[PDB]
Ligand binder design. Structure first.
Ligand SMILES: Nc1c(C(=O)O)cccc1[N+](=O)[O-]
Ligand SMILES: Nc1c(C(=O)O)cccc1[N+](=O)[O-]
Lengths: 278, 278
């Protein structure tokens, strides 16, 4: 049997944020069985905690209901928060297909309430499909350049001129399905405070609660386009329109041509705990 | 807090059949909170066990991740199997929006391993969109008349000339999305033994494991079209192609013009058990 916990990542209140199921002591599960369990749970992702293979604290395998992923933000944040309940360490090194990811755990009275992660440094380029994407979103233009970032998944960023304009979007999800292997992240805000909405037929998401792997890229995008500086953190509020408000904090250090660190942090909270029969 | 169990309905082996989450002692949860919990779990349905209002044993509310349903087969079967663990009664009367549904519980050494339910008696008519539906499915013709049945949901039946032809279907799911408020059930077989596959963009299902509300209608369809008699049970195997084999048993008593009972039964098994923090 296996114990699991359901963590709402990028939230401090249950039923907010973005859920992940975390399965402990998973070394006896073949990968095909992990995939079947992730399909059974049908959450955005289920993760599985394994013994480390390269000097980290644990190896984490990440599964959507259909495929394994090499890296994902909210699932790894939730995993760090869940595992932090079972260690006294101030930081946790979680091995993934993309390498060993460092977390810094934040506790109050032994309970891990938040964590910060160092993400893969993304690459980026112009999407080059602006008219098609804007038509699918139902708008005439973006504020800032429409660029697509890669850090495992791919994330496109489209800027809106106000938070009210962001909330008013009603995208044509059929038209968005022509955008393969990417998520579409629409954003608005100013200064330290930004709002986002994410849509991705390709990744099986009508509209996402908290797209943690997009938070780092968004900080880079805002710094490149002069809205913040490199080294300054932003607070990104996502998921409001779908009733799953999520707070992601992100910072990118260095300069566009020589990024040295991309950090993303958030709260997490336990929604439930249980045991499965295999 | 609330306890829940995950039941794989229409299966005797975990990771087969069709999952449902069953939440006990739910009288303190407002319906908006039940809906939020069902969205959090993201299973096909979550059900909530409430005190009865009309002389049954319990009132069951059924939620998909997006809406409440008045009746659903696999969720109610799983609920009866989960609740049967907490009573000695041979049968359970579960109240729903469609009325009080009688279950007969089947136990071995106190464990409920199967149950049989009496479903709402369906109505039916010709679909009248045959060429469109056949094109969406990728085939030229049906064996038996293409008719749509209503017992809460709506289920269309398209017959294939062999089990191998059924397994070979690769429907155009975009074309199927033009069929609103219905599921498309394709079937093949002979005698007592039938195979089914179900597809429903309208109900949020690419391909379903076990469509319990379609089993009763299928028995009626086979009897009307001379493949079985009224009063004879069939075994329907669904979900093979997607790795979630499910066995549903169904029987319709009476005659087409005067149906007296529609019974559907299946095994169920616990996949997991847990507790949520609200
Ligand atoms: N994390 C992802 C996702 C996702 O988050 O849905 C999708 C495709 C690829 C990756 N990746 O390569 O890491
Ligand atoms: N059970 C359903 C479903 C479903 O099973 O997805 C969908 C629409 C309506 C009903 N209904 O009215 O009972």
């Amino acid at each position: 049997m296996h114990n699991y916990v359901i963590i709402d990542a990028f939230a401090s209140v249950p039923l907010e944020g973005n859920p992940v199921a975390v399965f402990f002591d998973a070394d006896d599960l073949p990968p095909a069985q992990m995939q079947r369990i992730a399909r059974e749970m049908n959450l955005s992702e289920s993760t599985f905690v394994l013994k480390p293979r390269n000097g980290g604290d644990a190896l984490i395998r990440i599964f959507t209901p259909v495929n394994e992923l090499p890296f994902a933000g909210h699932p790894l944040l939730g995993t760090a928060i869940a595992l932090g309940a079972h260690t006294d360490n101030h930081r946790l090194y979680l091995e993934t297909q993309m390498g060993t990811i460092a977390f810094e755990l934040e506790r109050q009275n032994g309970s891990v309430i938040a964590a910060s992660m160092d993400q893969p440094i993304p690459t980026w380029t112009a999407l080059g499909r602006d008219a098609e994407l804007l038509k699918a979103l139902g708008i005439s233009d973006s504020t800032f350049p429409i660029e697509i970032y890669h850090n495992g998944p791919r994330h496109v960023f489209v800027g809106l001129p106000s938070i009210d304009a962001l909330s008013a979007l009603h995208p044509d999800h059929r038209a968005l399905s022509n955008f393969h292997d990417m998520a579409i992240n629409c954003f608005a805000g100013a200064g330290r405070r930004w709002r986002s909405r994410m849509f991705s037929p390709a990744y099986g998401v009508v509209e996402d609660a908290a797209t943690g792997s997009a938070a780092g890229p968004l900080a880079i995008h805002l710094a490149r386009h002069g809205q913040i500086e490199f080294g300054q953190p932003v607070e990104i509020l996502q998921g409001v329109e779908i009733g799953r408000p999520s707070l992601m904090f992100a910072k990118a250090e260095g300069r566009a041509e020589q990024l040295t660190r991309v950090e993303v942090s958030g709260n997490g909270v336990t929604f439930g705990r249980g045991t499965i029969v295999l």
